[PDB]
């Protein structure tokens, strides 16, 4: 269901967005 | 320091986000 | 409801992205 | 300079995630 | 770099918003 | 309607974060 594929699409953004804190981290490590 | 917290920041976006996938599931459901 | 849940937590994640434009523009000033 | 443009951009999506959320408050209202 | 990986990152978040927009478009649809 | 209000927000959210992608790679050449 379309409902469904939303929710796995915000899943998959949810990661993104921790892989870019993640470089982030690495950045002020700087 | 002051990008660490913007990354901290994000990291409850995303904590949020799933939440929001787990609340349409139960809408589908 | 569940859809107000959603609403909620999108209001959080603005709040929190307000929180880290405030950061940066402490790192440029 | 180009830090406070992306502070900018940031406080608008902000606002446009509000407003989504009121939209989703008023779906629910239904 | 660094900034720029975050930003190829972005992209792909801003892609993926895209196809929840397109999938409640679809929603509207039946 | 409502739903097709949010896509079109959200898809002016994913234009946002296209010019913060496109900034952070200024910041960074630079
Ligand atoms: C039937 O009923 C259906 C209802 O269906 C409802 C569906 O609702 C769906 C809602 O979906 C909502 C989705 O929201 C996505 C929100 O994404 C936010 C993304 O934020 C990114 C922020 O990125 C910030 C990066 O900042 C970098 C700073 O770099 C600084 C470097 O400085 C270096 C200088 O030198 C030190």
């Given at each position: ?9 915000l ?20």
């Amino acid at each position: 269901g379309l409902l469904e594929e939303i929710a796995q699409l915000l899943e998959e953004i949810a990661k993104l967005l921790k892989k870019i804190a993640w470089l982030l981290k690495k950045i002020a490590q700087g």
